[PDB]
Amino acid sequence: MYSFPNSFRFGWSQAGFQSEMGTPGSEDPNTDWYKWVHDPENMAAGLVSGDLPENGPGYWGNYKTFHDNAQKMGLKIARLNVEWSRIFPNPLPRPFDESKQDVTEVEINENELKRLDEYANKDALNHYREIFKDLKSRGLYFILNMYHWPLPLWLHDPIRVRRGDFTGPSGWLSTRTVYEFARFSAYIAWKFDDLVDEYSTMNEPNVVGGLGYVGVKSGFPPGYLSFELSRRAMYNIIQAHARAYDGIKSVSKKPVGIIYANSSFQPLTDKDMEAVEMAENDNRWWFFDAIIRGEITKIVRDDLKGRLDWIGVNYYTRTVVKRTEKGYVSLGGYGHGCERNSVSLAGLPTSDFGWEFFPEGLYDVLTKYWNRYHLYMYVTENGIADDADYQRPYYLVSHVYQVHRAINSGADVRGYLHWSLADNYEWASGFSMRFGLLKVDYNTKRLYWRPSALVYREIATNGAITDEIEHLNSVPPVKPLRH
Amino acid sequence: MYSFPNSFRFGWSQAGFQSEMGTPGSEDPNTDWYKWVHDPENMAAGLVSGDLPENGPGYWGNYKTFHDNAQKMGLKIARLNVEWSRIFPNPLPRPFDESKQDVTEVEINENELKRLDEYANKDALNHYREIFKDLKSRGLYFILNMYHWPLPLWLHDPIRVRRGDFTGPSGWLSTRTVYEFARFSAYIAWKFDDLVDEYSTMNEPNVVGGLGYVGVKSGFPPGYLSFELSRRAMYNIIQAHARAYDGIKSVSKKPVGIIYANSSFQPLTDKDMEAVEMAENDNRWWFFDAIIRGEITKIVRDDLKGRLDWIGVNYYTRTVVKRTEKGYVSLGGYGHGCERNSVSLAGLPTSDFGWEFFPEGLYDVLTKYWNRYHLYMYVTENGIADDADYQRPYYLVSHVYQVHRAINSGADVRGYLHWSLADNYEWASGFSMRFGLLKVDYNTKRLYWRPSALVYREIATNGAITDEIEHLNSVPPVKPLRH
Amino acid sequence: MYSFPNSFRFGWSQAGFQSEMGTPGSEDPNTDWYKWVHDPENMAAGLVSGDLPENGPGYWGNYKTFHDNAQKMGLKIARLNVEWSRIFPNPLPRPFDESKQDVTEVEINENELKRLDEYANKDALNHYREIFKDLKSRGLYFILNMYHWPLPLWLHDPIRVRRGDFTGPSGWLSTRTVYEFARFSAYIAWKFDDLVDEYSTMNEPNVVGGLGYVGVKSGFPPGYLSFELSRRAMYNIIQAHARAYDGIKSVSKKPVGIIYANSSFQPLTDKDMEAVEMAENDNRWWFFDAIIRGEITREKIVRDDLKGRLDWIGVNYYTRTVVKRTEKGYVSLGGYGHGCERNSVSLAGLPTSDFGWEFFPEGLYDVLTKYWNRYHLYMYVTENGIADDADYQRPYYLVSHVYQVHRAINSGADVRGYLHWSLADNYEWASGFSMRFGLLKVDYNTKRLYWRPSALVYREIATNGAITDEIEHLNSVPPVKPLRH
Amino acid sequence: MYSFPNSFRFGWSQAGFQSEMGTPGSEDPNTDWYKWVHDPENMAAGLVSGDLPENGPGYWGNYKTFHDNAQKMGLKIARLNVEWSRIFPNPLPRPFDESKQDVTEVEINENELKRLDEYANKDALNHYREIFKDLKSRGLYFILNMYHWPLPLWLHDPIRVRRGDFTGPSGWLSTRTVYEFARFSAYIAWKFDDLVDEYSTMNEPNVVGGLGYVGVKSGFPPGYLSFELSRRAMYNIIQAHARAYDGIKSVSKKPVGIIYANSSFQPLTDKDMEAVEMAENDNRWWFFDAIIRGEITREKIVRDDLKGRLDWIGVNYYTRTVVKRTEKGYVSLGGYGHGCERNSVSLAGLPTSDFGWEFFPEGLYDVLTKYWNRYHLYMYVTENGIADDADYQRPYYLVSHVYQVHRAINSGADVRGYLHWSLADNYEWASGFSMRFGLLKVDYNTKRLYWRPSALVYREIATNGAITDEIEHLNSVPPVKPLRH
Ligand SMILES: *[C@H]1O[C@H](CO)[C@@H](O)[C@H](O)[C@H]1F
Ligand SMILES: *[C@H]1O[C@H](CO)[C@@H](O)[C@H](O)[C@H]1F
Ligand SMILES: *[C@H]1O[C@H](CO)[C@@H](O)[C@H](O)[C@H]1F
Numbered sequence A, B: 001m002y003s004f005p006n007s008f009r010f011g012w013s014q015a016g017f018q019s020e021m022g023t024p025g026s027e028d029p030n031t032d033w034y035k036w037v038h039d040p041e042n043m044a045a046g047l048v049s050g051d052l053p054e055n056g057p058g059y060w061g062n063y064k065t066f067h068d069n070a071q072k073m074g075l076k077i078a079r080l081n082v083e084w085s086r087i088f089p090n091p092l093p094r095p096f097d098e099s100k101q102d103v104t105e106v107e108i109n110e111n112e113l114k115r116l117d118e119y120a121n122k123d124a125l126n127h128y129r130e131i132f133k134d135l136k137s138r139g140l141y142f143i144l145n146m147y148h149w150p151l152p153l154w155l156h157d158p159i160r161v162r163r164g165d166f167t168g169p170s171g172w173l174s175t176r177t178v179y180e181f182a183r184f185s186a187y188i189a190w191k192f193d194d195l196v197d198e199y200s201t202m203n204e205p206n207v208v209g210g211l212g213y214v215g216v217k218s219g220f221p222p223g224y225l226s227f228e229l230s231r232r233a234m235y236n237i238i239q240a241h242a243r244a245y246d247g248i249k250s251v252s253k254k255p256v257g258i259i260y261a262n263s264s265f266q267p268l269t270d271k272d273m274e275a276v277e278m279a280e281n282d283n284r285w286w287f288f289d290a291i292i293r294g295e296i297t298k299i300v301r302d303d304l305k306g307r308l309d310w311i312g313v314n315y316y317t318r319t320v321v322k323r324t325e326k327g328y329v330s331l332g333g334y335g336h337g338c339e340r341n342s343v344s345l346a347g348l349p350t351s352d353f354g355w356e357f358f359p360e361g362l363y364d365v366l367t368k369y370w371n372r373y374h375l376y377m378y379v380t381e382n383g384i385a386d387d388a389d390y391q392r393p394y395y396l397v398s399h400v401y402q403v404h405r406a407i408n409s410g411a412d413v414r415g416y417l418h419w420s421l422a423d424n425y426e427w428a429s430g431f432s433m434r435f436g437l438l439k440v441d442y443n444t445k446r447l448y449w450r451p452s453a454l455v456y457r458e459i460a461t462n463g464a465i466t467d468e469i470e471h472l473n474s475v476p477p478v479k480p481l482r483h
Numbered sequence C, D: 001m002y003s004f005p006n007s008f009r010f011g012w013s014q015a016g017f018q019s020e021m022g023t024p025g026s027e028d029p030n031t032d033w034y035k036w037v038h039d040p041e042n043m044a045a046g047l048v049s050g051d052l053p054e055n056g057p058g059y060w061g062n063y064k065t066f067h068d069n070a071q072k073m074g075l076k077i078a079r080l081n082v083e084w085s086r087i088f089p090n091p092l093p094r095p096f097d098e099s100k101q102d103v104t105e106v107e108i109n110e111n112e113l114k115r116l117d118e119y120a121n122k123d124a125l126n127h128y129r130e131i132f133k134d135l136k137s138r139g140l141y142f143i144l145n146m147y148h149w150p151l152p153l154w155l156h157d158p159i160r161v162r163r164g165d166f167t168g169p170s171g172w173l174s175t176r177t178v179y180e181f182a183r184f185s186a187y188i189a190w191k192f193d194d195l196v197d198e199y200s201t202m203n204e205p206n207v208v209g210g211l212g213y214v215g216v217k218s219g220f221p222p223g224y225l226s227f228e229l230s231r232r233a234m235y236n237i238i239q240a241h242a243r244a245y246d247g248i249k250s251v252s253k254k255p256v257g258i259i260y261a262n263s264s265f266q267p268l269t270d271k272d273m274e275a276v277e278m279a280e281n282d283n284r285w286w287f288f289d290a291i292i293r294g295e296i297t298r299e300k301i302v303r304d305d306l307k308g309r310l311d312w313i314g315v316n317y318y319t320r321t322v323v324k325r326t327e328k329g330y331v332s333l334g335g336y337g338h339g340c341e342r343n344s345v346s347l348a349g350l351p352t353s354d355f356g357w358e359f360f361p362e363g364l365y366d367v368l369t370k371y372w373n374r375y376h377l378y379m380y381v382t383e384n385g386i387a388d389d390a391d392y393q394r395p396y397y398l399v400s401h402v403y404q405v406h407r408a409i410n411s412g413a414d415v416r417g418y419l420h421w422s423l424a425d426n427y428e429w430a431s432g433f434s435m436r437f438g439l440l441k442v443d444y445n446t447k448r449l450y451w452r453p454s455a456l457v458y459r460e461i462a463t464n465g466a467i468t469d470e471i472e473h474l475n476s477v478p479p480v481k482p483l484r485h
């Protein structure tokens, strides 16, 4: 067996936009993401699938059932977000010089929070309180995340921006968004601190900026292709994180972290070790050096330094890189760039999403973060698109084993949160990518236990990979699978 | 949910030759099957795999572990056999005219049984008693089968017969085998009746005669191709069953049945309904009409009539048939005649063994037996060769659902015994075909729970297909599988 | 045997941007498409493959070898374009009210043509003459097409437009492009009429507008997502075709047609026949009714300056599109036609190409006879072929489609040739070199050409003017069992 | 370009039982193989496919069409056999001590030959003359092989032997068969020497003995599993070859060889080179050392009646066999060579044929040079080809193997021809018609022959006496990505 520390918790992560809608009364039409996926031109271009989030798994109405299942599964931790748009669907009065590049301080106090209180949707706040109370009643430790991608439409009209019109609400391209995010975060902590155990400011800010402004074939808003604007967005989100951290801490003593998208960078040949380091710099360290050490572009900002208590490690697979004349390149046929339901260039099985099976990468990522920063971590996201459940038992056990490995090596990792408890709306891809331990019938909203959920119950209730399921710490046999 | 009657039991079936060997001290070299799979010429021809049963899962030594797992899985019934060869490894004195075609009576009494007692291996008998006592101690209802293919070498030297030499011990071609089988059966019932709940005389006698003397590419002993001898073998096994029934009943009041190999015969087109009936006659009814109604070739034998209390239904898949000028033919590309790890001509997924997914056939088979004979049934064998466990969750739930269907239609079915609890020696195919709910590491003899074992625990402990696993009542998705 | 009329020609089609570059001195850096495929942001987004056209098959320098192989193969017809950008790499003098929606006339006269001649690249012009003379010397009948997608950069900066900046040269969004295209076409006809047998104005205008402004994941320039601008571009392209027809006709008596991208619209169920007609309307008839009948929407009007501007129709065809009737109209279905997985099988169990396109030769018969019945204009099959580096499917694809043209003629359709796409592998736009459509395989390192077995099959057809008895079995679906699923 | 010597010939090989039947009046019901494939028990067991040879490609009646296509293809060599059973359908008079293990001499003289002539079927003899004359009239050099597996029923009742009854005619288990084969071969040479260029005694004797008496799942007659009888059959076949060589030589001066089944033995790891040599010994050298050097085991002796009975070696080749060193000796590995899944990929990632045979052309170079270096006898590649109905892989298979023969010659090996298996599809023994090895596809309903694209490729090779520059790319592995795994 592989036994975890007594304090270690197994659970799940989920997002508001992806899971909340589906029950009549739950509709939230007031985000950039909602408008984006309903857009006729985006649908015709195939940038979005045409599936709509209001036809989703219905966590807004059915949360007690989700929680019932999580409890039966032996889970002890959950991480979810509040949707900004639900709490503040209407524009807030303008506060602050918008032409200033840096946002070093956002003044938050009791009076300001009472003023914000008057714009807040009380029905939305009360409902979230009901969800979170029910969550805590099952003995679930609660990580509350402030942000998981959709912005209020009054802060970002993504179709205007897609069209090249920058005179409207411009999302992360505007310091107004940074200012309002800091206040939103302080406000939520103020309202919910009695229920929350730890905070995250944001989920995967690197994906928001990266796919929003460079990876435009992904169909992420606002889908405006610009290196310059991607950099500006990331610059803003970094300061938003730091200001949100300060805002939360002005109101709470609880740990405040961030959740980030990772790949394990791997060398094509033994000549490519430098390529790996350059990739890690460009994709990971530059960001964390900013919010931990205050280092940015090369200066040190005192308002950025030390704004992090913990690191949420999201992980699916590797990225294979090679050294190039001018720098380095990532290789197709490995990691996330494989054919769906097939095999990679290395002979490893790929998911419904085309992502290569590579659990060793998780050990790489956890130990690299640990060695650089010595901040404790949660694995906040890890799972596989697999409607049939063919690969998930192996994927689950293997990755959980790698976490045990990391801890054994000395890394402080305090939980593992699978993505996800149930199937949900996979962004531009729609519902077809199914990541749940529980299968959702979207017609009836009924939840079913895939056999991997039974396997996860074994792990969670025992606090260990037990002897009986240890064989699942292996690669899914490829011979019976599609090539 | 699909709830079963309160008296219905879920369990497993297994065979002595397939599961017993593997622990030092368990070796039984004294059968036709042992000699057959060790034969140099058979190995060179590829009639046998070259794997050997002494390297098996080790139930002889490790039975307590098997039983521990079965108990944890919530199982309430088991069917196993004693190996004739273990109890009587040495030739018995000749009794009886061997040239007589019919064996209508075998006189068994207390003195004769005490005489047999003096030739019996007491170590073998005591060990089986220890296994069966431990079995009963877990609350397992016990079906004891007398015969599951291997014969003592003193009754059959299969290599002599393969070579066309009929002067030696000739197995089912000899009425001496019939006579000794009746006595063996009476003797075992005499010794074990205190532990046994129900009896079976034999497992799949149709496969012994069919593959032994016609399907010679299967590598079953003695592999001598002859329509005439196949008929003679089946004739003898039928009378052996009837004489064993009488022998058991002379010593016990408990139910005595038989376990038989079935396919669901299915028409290629709507013009092939007569073909199905002819196939069912030729493969099923002729045999059961003999031992139930005494009808044979067309006379009635009073010594054959009524020798059956229950029917063990084994089932894996369908056989598709078409009407022909002269009669009917079975079609390749369906049922058991498909490519391994692929899809049939109908687009249905196939197993590691090349057998097509067709659970509807089980309902067909159970209701056809019920309507003809009105004898109660157990599903004594059903499962899938699937080392990866990709298809087994679906295969398990779907077939269990079909049993529920049969009962709902009025058929008296009293249990479902999966083939098998753990991986075992698959005859001429060796170890590569893995049918276990538990995976065996043959190097260490350790047992692991495949996720289907967790699913089966849900069914067995609840006496139902529960709401949460009901989605597994469906075909494994073929898109992610090999074609 | 399936024998074709004595006058019927078998040949090939090719494009300048896709095949010309690759030999020293052949580079043409002056198009929207060139800039588009070299753009760092496009490359990082994966909108373009990162392959570059200047590493291509080298027709500019190696045309004699291409033609040698085509002659050996028994081909008797070729359709090729001149690249606008090579002839006019620098801007021409502004002439004309740019705010006017319609362009009903573009006056061109001998003096105007002589002025244009002062701005033309003479090296480019003379090189094209050398290519075309050599082509004619092999006995190849010549269809000269004026346009096959790239515009001179001085008429379209696609990166600016991608970024949502409409102050620069805006390609088909501007009537200046329409005006200049008319002049360009008249000019090329004026210079080359002694070498040309028939003319096409454009290749697949519907793809330029459709992928440029709606199907933006395809990585076609300028990749600015707008229903309204797609319609504006198509409106301009339609008037550019008409103005180019008049321009050519001012200078030549030879037939002038257009080449257009087609799929065969097929009903999912027997309840979807109306869906097919609606898709045919929206994808095909609306365009050809404008340039043949002068019918258009601006309400529904007849423009006398558009009516009758077409002598022949170039039918391009790869596969079907399966459509189903919807509440609000119709939709096309994934898993059939060009929307399949690569090297696999469609939802109907038909094999797919390296490009993910379904094998459906029957669709060519559908398309040819439908055009014939509507307009009664003679046709050439101007593009038909398959992405297939291995040559597994191409022998079947070639024979089967050629058979369907024989079928169409047999039904009464006037079809005068079949031009395979293509003689040799070439640069497949945003996909780069990996999609190989050649009868001949190109080694891009040496520029050497190799005969795939399908090329031997094509030689049998072309030399005999028939699908001969010996290769008739190839009129069938490639066996799916040995192929990838 | 890879050019062959001016004297080198490209052609094909074919067998009587596999190709002759299919036309009215061509039936030959009088062999062990005929009885074997019609046997109800064999069919029910699946030992044979249920397909029947009398529904075959019809060479008996359609030989002129076969030859027309071969001439069109530029072929210049053919190897064919006479079926013993057609010439002597009824038993000959018993001559000779059957209990003697060795047959050191078989006296044949003109008077004996004239007596044999009284028993021969004259219609069969005259028909074969008509076939062979027509063959020679196309300019095809003729290798006549005497035996390609089926024996007259009066010499072998395989069902009786399958059943373990050795009292009847027992085929290669009897020295009577050896004696009669010698006479038969002398007789055929005596009758046909004016038409024949070179002779082979037998085709693949190692398969007759190996699959007949050990590899019994293959469904070859008599399918009686016995190491001891396999050795006895091989011993007899060896002396039958020697006696047939002397018999032919008594009547002709022309070269007399043998055709043998080969695989290239390859080491799994660098530690397995000894395993290869042991496999080469056991599968190849033991046989050829007997008939060339007279060395045999009965202990290890030299028989003067066996020594030197070979002028040339016919090299048959499909694929490799991978072997590994074992405690007790060596073993061959599944998942490589002929032990792969059909239409898939081997453990090494190499594509497999419709028969499950791995693509490994390098093995042909290995086999040819090894024979050359051991014996220094000239060779023909007498059999090489692939089961491939779709023709996906055959173009690569053909070009690549032909290249490896060019390689062997270049290294100094005397190789005088390459004969593809086969010109047309035919009856593949226990597998029936489903395994299609033809350059030409046969429609078994009409008996019509179609040229697969590989046949066009072969015509390029044969007419040029070279792999030409244009098809040189086919000297490569069929791309695996678009194929089934
Ligand atoms: C992490 O990845 C999963 C799978 O793509 C997404 O659904 C989550 O929103 C993202 F946070
Ligand atoms: C029923 O079938 C299974 C799978 O072939 C065998 O292992 C059993 O012995 C037979 F009874
Ligand atoms: C017709 O289609 C082919 C293949 O997509 C393109 O290469 C041509 O440029 C287009 F005209």
Ligand SMILES: *[C@H]1O[C@H](CO)[C@@H](O)[C@H](O)[C@H]1F
Pocket (backbone or CB within 6 Å): D015, D018, D203, D204, D316, D383, D421, D428, D437
């Ligand atoms: C050589 O091999 C081929 C293919 O198995 C057979 O058809 C020939 O008869 C044999 F000589």
